Design a protein around this ligand. Structure first.
Ligand SMILES: [Fe+3]
Ligand SMILES: [Fe+3]
Ligand SMILES: [Fe+3]
Ligand SMILES: [Fe+3]
Ligand SMILES: [Fe+3]
Ligand SMILES: [Fe+3]
Lengths: 164, 165, 165, 164, 165, 164
């Protein structure tokens, strides 16, 4: 169907934009806020969003017969005042890509299509995994106030049977 | 220096846009014209532009003290009708990137700023290397008109010189 | 979601109660019927119930932001007479667990909450797995009338699929 | 739960019949059109259809409580005229198998039998996997004409994370 | 030599039909008589019949120059009432396959076609081998009474000659 | 004997109830107080009581021929304010388990039941080990205020000839 194709192309575009903006965030975090390991963490998020997250969609298109568009336009206008607000912006972006995927899954079931449902299961799982990771990183900036302790913990972080 | 920073920001943006365009071309050539290994080759080029070619610039800006800006935008509305035309398209893109980086190198040598000359030497080398890598594949479509033989050749190709390595 | 949280609290308490009952049944079957291996089998089932089947629910709660409630109460006041009635009672308990899981799955699907659907698929599979594991032993008693042969069979069972496993 | 019982019996019968027809097709493709590796390919397809595809159904029947019925009748009288039409015929057969299994899955959801849905996910995936494996072979016959080149390619032709 | 051609086509048909029938019998034996290992044994017979027993005929046809024909008509509608009757049905089918292959061999030798004789010697041996393999398990249902001993013995048979090898 | 049977049934019931309560406390510590490693500590604590601590009793009952009774009543409706009060509550629980075991040992020695004395020696020895392992953690919340320091210390604590 064409509804499914539109939804998948929108998710493609969203993933590309997220990857680019995350890369910029990682750079500004490492360089301006004196936190290299936060930079590595957000860089890994950005490389994940520009890697398999869209290669899988392109592969599915080549496989079943849909066609692919390309329209991305991003520009960074502001950068949060501290590390905490930045990590919270990241948390919000992920929290919304979750609901985007939920909408796509409902649409899939309502269209008598089941290959698309079996396919979108992967994103249903990865969304929650990534959210719990970024939240476990968010929950540090309240348990402490020293910067180097948080950085050491993130260092030892950057090195399940259902949600795994 | 402001001119150096502006040229390097333009180069960063250019690499990003080329990477996106190459990935889309790879999908097209693998789905529309039935040549999977050409698709894998162009996809490798795409993973190369979106990879070290911008990480190095970001790291340099971290080191020397320059500022980064990100503003990209692309749209792929017209795509060639064959495989030969597609590979010649990407050939032209590489040939233009060569001239862009030569301009940056001249600008760096004029400003009496030698760390940037040292930095840009790597791009001076990699440009010619990638240009020959893609021209070697362009030369195939003038040898045979059989698709599967060209497929076998590019296949064995996807599977280093001292100076231009 | 609130009703999903109620259903999952229900299932948590159900699993805890079943685990305690199964531990008692294993002790009884070992000490009163002189069948130590039937005891080992039921005890493995009990350690399965009090183990993974509730830590998974706890982890899901800690991951999506729901609230866990704990209120259990159990008292085994009557046991069956022989081994066959015991194993048939165990069969009935498992068979009711199946129905409870189906209820939860339907409820989750009817209100557009798909993470819980993906979560509950595991329980959907494990239900039938455990049920056939139990019925394999249930069928043994109708195939003989001696006890020690059943002992040897259960032993070679406990000393041991792409879809259901 | 007899509706799903009947549907699964339909699928069992269809599987064995396709297996036999493919065995005959492989013999024909080897002996008549001088292509032994196309023979190997269709032979592996038939070994797949008569292999796990029906043992899984028998096992689900043994586990849940349904009953099995064997009822087969096959006759191969008219065969395609050349290799391309043969591989295209196989393509269409598997294309129809996909529609059949999708109908089974919709019926399974419509009856609140979630074990059946969980069971049929496997076929829903393997259908598209086999379909793309056969499409990859049928697309070779338009890329050249020398039968020996195509023989070499199919020779060198004999796993993903989602469709794996 | 259309005689040997029609005989081998008949044998192909019969092999496929007994393959399917053995599959169905293995199912009904595992599910209704509560004897899993007897089901494994009959399933191994089923998988043998549809296996090399017909690929050898099709391969000889390719290598020689005869024509192949497929036609199957199977319908299972009546099932024996216990395990003994089932294994005796299997016994009768094997005993008939022996007679069929003997007829084929005599026809081949009377036709002055010695390649068919050389080919059919394999089936001449394997028929007696498989008949002995089935008779060994037939003889079990007259030596004991409880199903579990028979299960253990069939299991040890299925987990494990210079002439009839 | 009879009094020994009654005391041992009491102890079995107590150990089961402690297991369940400690499980709940571990969950609430990890989720609400943002301390996952304390959660794992208390989780191993719980799984200890629902492990050997009751299987040993049931085994001894099978071995000398006493009668086992199960009856459990557990409902948690009050929870401490933060981690310190939590671990202090745990400390009180273990401290009470000690003197329950002492009462059992005295009763066993009075009635000239020496097999029960030899049995309860294990429970007598493995009360001071548990109490000192809990005290090592409860006296960490006196030295520091930066929750991540205590987190790392407990982490390294997770991963004797007489008492051991
Ligand atoms: Fe991800
Ligand atoms: Fe490069
Ligand atoms: Fe289980
Ligand atoms: Fe398949
Ligand atoms: Fe044989
Ligand atoms: Fe202890």
């Amino acid at each position: 169907s064409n509804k499914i194709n539109d939804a998948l192309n929108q998710h493609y575009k969203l993933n590309v934009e997220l990857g680019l903006v995350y890369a910029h965030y990682a750079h500004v975090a490492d360089d301006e806020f004196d936190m290299p390991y936060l930079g590595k963490f957000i860089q890994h998020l950005s490389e994940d969003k520009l890697g398999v997250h869209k290669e899988y969609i392109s592969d599915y298109f080549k496989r079943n017969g849909m066609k692919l568009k390309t329209d991305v336009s991003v520009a960074v206008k502001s950068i949060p005042s501290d590390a905490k607000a930045l990590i919270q912006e990241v948390y919000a972006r992920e929290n919304e890509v979750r609901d985007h995927v939920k909408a796509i899954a409902k649409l899939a079931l309502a269209e008598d299509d089941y290959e698309s449902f079996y396919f979108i299961q992967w994103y249903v799982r990865d969304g929650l995994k990534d959210l719990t990771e970024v939240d476990d990183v968010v929950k540090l900036f309240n348990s402490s106030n020293d910067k180097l302790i948080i950085e050491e913990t993130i260092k030892e972080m950057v090195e399940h049977e259902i949600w795994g």
